[PDB]
């Protein structure tokens, strides 16, 4: 009695666009076109689709099927499957905290760009400002200009010295203090996600209507804008120019495998939370199929959106779009792409809809990222929670604000890259590998096929079976071993990270991981009997 069964989605289209909003993010815009044009050019589509079909789709569909069938959170679902792995739900909660620290500061930059785009004359055009050096050299100035190693563009000057104020920090050692403008920008983001979350999936699905759809409009506007630009074919040429010798590199498949995983983000429990609220009779197979294609096709058309403007930017300069595409990261969108759209007519229009799109791309993914953890703890601690959902939502939101206070500093941009590379990447793959192995092996793939047979009415095909049994865990095992074997040496804004940054990153990487093996130690020490008896009861799920 009382509450009993959980809630359900309002409409089939709401959660369909909600999972699409979580998948489509900033990475689908800048990241995919860079790794595509760098590795093999247009030939990168061949391994990218293979890593999607074999690796990416089965994990995405397995994670989604477990959500709609069990209707449990990222924690409670392990109580009814493999209780020793219940720490997986806790690790995701620690992972999403590390994710939400930097992720909303990036949108705070795009929000600071959005609010600074309301002036008739955009600040990064002219070099006359409070934050510019004597190295600042803009256009609409004297011709014949020759660039200098020490010289800096007004857009690079604007992003370096103002929104980041990264010149005021020497590195990871001293990043202090905090920039309060980004603290207010991220506070508004934490407020707009507060009112888009606190109620539940009902408000998130409705706010997703705006946050998921608008990027495609802004992408289409910048697509038609970028296409009409003179000399935009150079970027598209360098974008789609096939290099088949790059396919012989053993690394490009790893880049394709890692790209498709982190773009779809399976096994993170967010897709598990979104599916928990759907209908039992409802079909999740057609959903996961088309949803992943949208994420890939959006990144494909986003490739033209970026490189058409990058091609025109290389047209006013001298060619080799690779050189203007040299630095990959926020500088591509916030400096190169922003300086490129500043030279176009009605630049206020395209600049507003650009950074708004960036906020629009990060809002939906941030809704679900918290939604997965909120659903996890609410389902894990029922009736000790749910007294008010705005209470637990406010607690996790303001916690991400204090966690972002380290990211809101002057050297906060240094911490963004430290957490994005070292921290989240390896542990999410590990927790998804342990998840995929536990579902396909411990719980068994036969009983999993029987649950789908009771769900949709038919057993899944042998293609998905061999993928879940072998191909999908091997897909995650491939990216793991490659990351651990070659830990990246990272550099940002003419500043090389210290040698010990990987040590600090491994601390942030293992700090989320320490829970599950200590929980397995907590489960095995509490369970009486012998090792074979207690583990069998620990391997056997809840009997009722």
């Amino acid at each position: 009695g009382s509450q009993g069964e959980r809630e359900t989605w309002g409409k089939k289209v709401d959660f369909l666009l909600s999972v699409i909003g979580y998948a489509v993010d900033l990475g689908n815009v800048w990241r995919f076109p860079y790794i595509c044009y760098q590795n093999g050019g247009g030939a990168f589509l061949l391994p990218y689709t293979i890593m999607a079909i074999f690796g990416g789709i089965p994990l995405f569909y397995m994670e989604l099927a477990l959500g709609q069938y069990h209707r449990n959170g990222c924690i409670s679902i392990w109580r009814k499957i493999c209780p020793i792995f219940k720490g997986i739900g806790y690790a995701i909660c620690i992972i999403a905290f590390y994710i939400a620290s930097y992720y909303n500061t990036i949108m705070a930059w795009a929000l600071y760009y959005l609010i600074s785009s309301f002036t008739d004359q955009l600040p990064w055009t002219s070099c006359k400002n409070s934050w510019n050096t004597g190295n600042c050299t803009n256009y609409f100035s004297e011709d014949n200009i020759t660039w200098t190693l020490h010289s800096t563009s007004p857009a690079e000057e604007f992003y370096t010295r103002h929104v980041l104020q990264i010149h005021r920090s020497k590195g990871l050692q001293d990043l202090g203090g905090i920039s309060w403008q980004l603290a207010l920008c991220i506070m508004l983001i934490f407020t707009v996600i507060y009112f888009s979350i606190w109620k539940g999936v009902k408000t998130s699905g409705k706010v997703v209507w705006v946050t998921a759809t608008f990027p495609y409009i802004a992408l289409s506007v910048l697509l038609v804008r970028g296409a009409t630009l003179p000399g935009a074919w150079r970027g598209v040429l360098f974008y789609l120019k096939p290099n088949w010798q790059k396919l012989l590199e053993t690394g490009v498949w790893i880049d394709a495998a890692a790209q498709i995983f982190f773009s779809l983000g399976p096994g993170f429990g967010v897709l598990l939370a979104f599916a928990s609220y759907n209908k039992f009779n409802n079909n999740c197979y057609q959903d996961a199929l088309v949803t992943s294609v949208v994420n890939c096709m959006t990144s494909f058309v986003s490739g033209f959106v970026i490189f058409t403007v990058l091609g025109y930017m290389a047209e006013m300069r001298n060619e080799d779009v690779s050189e203007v595409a040299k630095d990959a990261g926020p500088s591509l969108l916030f400096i190169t792409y922003a300086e490129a759209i500043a030279n176009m007519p009605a630049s206020t229009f395209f600049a507003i809809i650009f950074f708004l799109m960036l906020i629009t791309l990060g809002l939906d993914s941030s809704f679900a990222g918290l939604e997965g953890v909120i659903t996890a703890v609410l389902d894990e601690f029922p009736h000790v929670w749910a007294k008010r959902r705005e209470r637990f939502v406010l607690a996790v939101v303001i916690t991400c604000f204090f966690g972002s206070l380290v990211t809101l500093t002057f050297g906060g941009a240094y911490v963004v890259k430290l957490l994005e590379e070292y921290a989240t990447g390896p542990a999410v793959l590990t927790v998804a590998l342990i998840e995929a192995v536990a579902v396909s092996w411990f719980y068994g793939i036969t009983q999993f096929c029987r649950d789908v047979k009771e769900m949709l009415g038919f057993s899944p095909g042998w293609f998905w079976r061999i993928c879940w049994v072998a191909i999908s865990p091997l897909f995650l095992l491939f990216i793991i071993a490659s990351f651990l074997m070659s830990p990246p040496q990272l550099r940002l804004f003419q500043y090389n990270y210290p040698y010990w940054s990987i040590i600090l990153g491994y601390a942030i990487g293992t700090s989320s991981f320490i829970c599950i093996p200590t929980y397995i130690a907590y489960r095995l020490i509490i369970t009486p009997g012998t090792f074979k008896e207690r583990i069998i009861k620990s391997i056997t799920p809840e009997t009722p």
């Epitope: 660039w147 190693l149 020490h150 001298n318 080799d320 690779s322 003419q494």
Partner: antibody, heavy 119, light 108 residues
């Protein structure tokens, strides 16, 4: 004004190593890339690679990768180029030339260094 | 990579005649081209950059033109001290390459 003074000619045996100094003056040394151009007898000019004086960042050529090593010193404002595994093809005139980051052109060249690899 | 091709290794002209040396690149350069003058026994001297523009210290008799793969280096008045070997070079893509060179022989 701007002068790039290289080292003198060198006669070395094959299989050995050789180093060529470049002395720059007349401008701000940290404001420009430093490049090295190889010219074979009767052949065209060949770009070996550049170097950034500030951090020593070296952008080489795929043809010269591992064949040449570019170094720089900001104290005396001097750039060097080292070559190992010397053959008869390596006998040629080498030039160190100044270039900006954009547009990329060689405005000032060194007087040249005559290299002869023989026993 | 990029291949700069000068089809004429030698071009015969006279003092005062209008001479034009061509250049052929691999792909479209827009306008980025540098014309150098290397006198025998001297280092290569820069003359033209961005294919229409002259470097400082270059007399008015040296011009350049063209936007595309093909470019033209034009000398209206040839002198006796103008005897040298001219090269064309592209600056966009790494690595930077040079043409085979065209030796200008003066007819008298």
């Amino acid at each position: 004004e701007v002068q790039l003074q290289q080292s003198g000619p060198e006669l070395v045996k094959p299989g050995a190593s050789v180093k060529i100094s470049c002395k720059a003056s007349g401008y701000t040394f940290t404001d420009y890339y430093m490049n090295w151009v190889k010219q074979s007898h009767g052949k065209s000019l060949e770009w070996i690679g550049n170097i950034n004086p500030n951090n020593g960042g070296t952008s080489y050529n795929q043809k010269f990768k591992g064949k040449a090593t570019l170094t720089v010193d900001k104290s005396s404002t001097t750039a060097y180029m080292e070559l190992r595994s010397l053959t008869s093809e390596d006998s040629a005139v080498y030039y160190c030339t100044r270039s900006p980051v954009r547009p990329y052109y060689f405005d000032y060249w060194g007087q040249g260094t005559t290299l002869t690899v023989s026993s | 990579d990029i291949v700069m091709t000068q089809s004429h290794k030698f071009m015969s002209t006279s003092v005062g005649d209008r001479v034009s040396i061509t250049c052929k690149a691999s792909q479209d350069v827009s306008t980025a081209v540098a014309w150098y003058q290397q006198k025998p026994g001297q280092s290569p001297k820069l003359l033209i950059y961005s294919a229409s523009y002259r470097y400082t210290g270059v007399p008015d008799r040296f011009t350049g033109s063209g936007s595309g793969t093909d470019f033209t280096f034009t000398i209206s008045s040839v002198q006796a001290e103008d005897l040298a070997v001219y090269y064309c070079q592209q600056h966009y893509s790494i690595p930077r390459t040079f043409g085979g060179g065209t030796k200008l022989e003066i007819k008298r």
